[PDB]
Design a protein around this ligand. Structure first.
Ligand code: VKB
Ligand code: CL
Ligand code: MG
Ligand code: MG
Length: 308
């Protein structure tokens, strides 16, 4: 494979280098792999990836925030180096079951800070809706902010989701690894070095059912027309909560030109007490502007801690 950027290779963190910095813990009938910076545990900043990725997504972002608060970054169940779900189901509520059980083992403070990307933001938002007294602040980006009606730059979203929900979508993902091999690199502006792509491919290198989480995630999409009713209700509930959460400081990181960002920025602006920043990127913006993102998050967390 070609290599691309001598400067990026100089500071690159491979899959094995990242995993060697992680911890593991049994959770319910399985286990979670996670990064835990440990220090400054009076606060906790929990970073949640979404589909196709793992805790590895945050590897160049977290160093900026670790000096200010304990940073904890799980691989969602069935993803990264975590164990598999006991029944092989990977819906939003399955992820939420393992995630919340893991939280109970971490010795968390009363009020937690969440940093969410994409479906990881949905998990944070649903946790917040159900634990409204446990939230210090929320950072979100390229996130599931609301139900999805008509996205101007994705006029075919309903047909594309119908394909993914059909048996053909199963072949695209389980046989051809569509989300890791096609969507992931297409929505990073730079070229990943081979070792970086290998870290994302590793959990899903074999064909078949091991790739189920990457198919189940898009099938959860909260489309008004045809979205899974339980997810649609979850998102409607947490959206209305966020719209009235005047006391809850938020940071929204817009991606320029972005992937979801164009459609969701209006929705993010409907949540009170939001600071707005912008970085270059498509969907997986951590791969294009990790240091700018890390510095913005660090500043935001520092301000939140000063004001309290
Ligand atoms: N994240 C996605 N990226 C790409 C595609 C996709 C699907 C089919 C296709 O032919 C090309 C791309 N789907 C999602 C699913 C999704 C989840 C939540 C919000 C919005 C989208
Ligand atoms: Cl998805
Ligand atoms: Mg040089
Ligand atoms: Mg198309």
């Amino acid at each position: 494979s070609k290599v691309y950027d001598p400067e990026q290779r100089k500071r690159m963190i491979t899959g094995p280098q990242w995993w060697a910095r992680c911890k593991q813990m049994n959770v319910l009938d399985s286990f979670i792999n996670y990064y835990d910076s440990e220090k400054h545990a009076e606060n906790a900043v929990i970073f949640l990836h979404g589909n196709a990725t793992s805790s590895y997504l945050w590897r160049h972002v977290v160093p900026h925030i670790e000096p200010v608060a304990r940073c904890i970054i799980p691989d969602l169940i069935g993803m990264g180096k975590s164990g598999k779900s006991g029944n092989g189901s990977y819906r939003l509520l399955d992820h939420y079951k393992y995630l919340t059980a893991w939280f109970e083992l971490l010795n968390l403070p009363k009020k937690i800070i969440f940093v969410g990307h994409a479906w990881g933001a949905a998990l944070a938002f649903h946790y917040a809706y159900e634990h409204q007294d446990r939230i210090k602040a929320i950072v979100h980006m390229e996130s599931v902010v609301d139900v999805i009606e008509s996205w101007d730059e994705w006029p075919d979203i309903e047909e594309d989701i119908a394909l993914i929900k059909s048996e053909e979508g199963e072949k695209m993902v389980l046989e051809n690894n569509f989300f890791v091999e096609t969507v992931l690199p297409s929505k990073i502006m730079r070229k990943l070095e081979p070792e970086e792509f290998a870290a994302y491919l590793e959990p899903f290198k074999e064909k078949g059912e091991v790739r189920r989480p990457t198919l189940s995630w898009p099938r959860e999409i909260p489309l008004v027309k045809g979205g899974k009713p339980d997810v649609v209700q979850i998102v409607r509930n947490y959206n209305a909560y966020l719209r009235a959460s005047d006391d809850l400081p938020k940071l929204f990181i817009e991606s320029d030109p972005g992937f979801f960002s164009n459609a969701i920025v209006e929705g993010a602006k409907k949540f009170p007490n939001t600071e707005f920043v912008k970085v270059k990127g498509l969907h997986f913006l951590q791969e294009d502007a990790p240091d700018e993102m890390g510095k913005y998050i660090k500043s935001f967390v520092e301000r939140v801690l000063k004001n309290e």
